[PDB]
Design a protein around this ligand. Sequence first.
Ligand SMILES: Nc1nc2c(ncn2[C@@H]2O[C@H](COP(=O)(O)OP(=O)(O)O)[C@@H](O)[C@H]2O)c(=O)[nH]1
Ligand SMILES: [Mg+2]
Ligand SMILES: [Mg+2]
Lengths: 346, 198
Amino acid sequence: XXXXXXXXXXXXXXXXXXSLQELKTVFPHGLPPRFAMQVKTFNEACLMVRKPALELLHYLKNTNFAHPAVRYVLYGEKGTGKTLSLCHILHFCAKQNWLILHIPDAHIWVKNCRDLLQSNYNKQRFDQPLEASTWLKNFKTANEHFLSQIKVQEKYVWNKRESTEKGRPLGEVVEQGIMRVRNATDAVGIVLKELKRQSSLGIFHLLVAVDGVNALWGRTTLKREDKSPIAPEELALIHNLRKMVKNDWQGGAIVLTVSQTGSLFKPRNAYLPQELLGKEGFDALDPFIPILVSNYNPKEFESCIQYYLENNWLQHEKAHTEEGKKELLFLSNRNPGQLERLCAYL
Amino acid sequence: WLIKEELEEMLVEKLSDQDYAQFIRLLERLSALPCGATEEDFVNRFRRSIPXXXXXXXXXXXXXXXXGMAFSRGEGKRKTAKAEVVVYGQGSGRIDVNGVDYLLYFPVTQDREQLMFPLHFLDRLGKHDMTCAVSGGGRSAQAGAVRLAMARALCSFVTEDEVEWMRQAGLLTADPRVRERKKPGQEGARRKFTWKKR
Ligand SMILES: Nc1nc2c(ncn2[C@@H]2O[C@H](COP(=O)(O)OP(=O)(O)O)[C@@H](O)[C@H]2O)c(=O)[nH]1
Ligand SMILES: [Mg+2]
Ligand SMILES: [Mg+2]
């Protein structure tokens, strides 16, 4: 299927490609691991375009940066393809030369943190250096041009012996937060608040993409040495990140996603926004655009099969028949994540 | 021919196997020649007749009043698990289980394969639309019950010939296999406490 760049309407269910340098540039952060497999396997980065992706992109074409920050939501069944329908957006508006703030899984913040550091600067907030540092190290390669341009107007204190005073390029702040890892989180929050402050200017076009928003108000796994569980409130990273969904600001766009897979305490089958977010989440999330994500339709499906045949990735003999199509259709219920797996061993 | 017990009843006489055998042997000699009228009557005395019946019983279809459409409702039962499956003759391929989709209700691939069996057999895979209610037991048991119920509800919409195929595929026959009760003084109904020679 034929393509050039992300935005075309009639190209629904066609194959968009990107380069490897385009890939290291646009997704320094994680790309969905199954798809990183796809890419490292086929040497080619390839994708198809879906009706919700089209819809979302056309909403992003009509955007007014004078208007307050607009929230979007991608919801759907497990492995229904909602995290990649985030990346479509990502490289589109990154090729439009915007600020791309991408957190691939919020859940990695709320769960499995080796080192919980206590910081009372923020009045009982905990910082997670491991995550902060990784996130910053990707964000560096994310947007390079914009990092030297931004001039932060603030005074900031890292240490008694260390400080940075206003008139500094932002990239400086970032890489100085990476070098000294213990305070990396503080620098993350700082980068964040000043990002939102500078978004008032026409220099910042901000796309804030947080996948697994449910993590923000959800119940947390991490614990104090008293065995007492800690709120999502108590996390420096999260407390600061909620501030970035708040719709208080201009020039930005926030695309969001509600996961099942990475979540905590939620049942396996709940793909509906109000469940995953809960009361606090939904309420604190304000009017948003609830974009449903669903299974491949027949056309997208025979398209996916077309594509897999094209790469000779189906190595089974009888895979070429209409028989093979009917089998894979019925076993997958033509679900993107399911078909991915049915082909992997086929 | 009569059993030994039936000749014993006919003559009001205890018999021996050898004797019975001798006689029946003689009746074969009789049948071996040209058969007269009274000859045939004579051997008819010692004749009996037996029934044999094999067909999978075919339910006439049922046309629903609401859409004016025909459906067939099957019931499978396997191993603590019963399932009921209503199959609609004009489908989108939709298959619903207990009010949720079949992919979600059988995350185990194996199960979905079991489900696929009858439909892939009869090449009807997209053609039919099924509603399903299943209860009892664990997942494989359930998927198998649905297999039986479905393959039963699929013989209204199939040809009279494909039926004998589904029999020889073993789709419509229940699974007699079930758990065997532990026995007291043993372990696992078969497994025994370790036996000691000394
Ligand atoms: N061809 C194609 N594949 C996709 C697309 N979106 C997702 N996939 C694949 O389908 C799988 C499921 O997508 P994902 O967003 O991770 O589902 P999630 O687990 O519900 O978030 C991924 O491994 C992708 O490789 C798409 O737009 N086109
Ligand atoms: Mg996901
Ligand atoms: Mg045992």
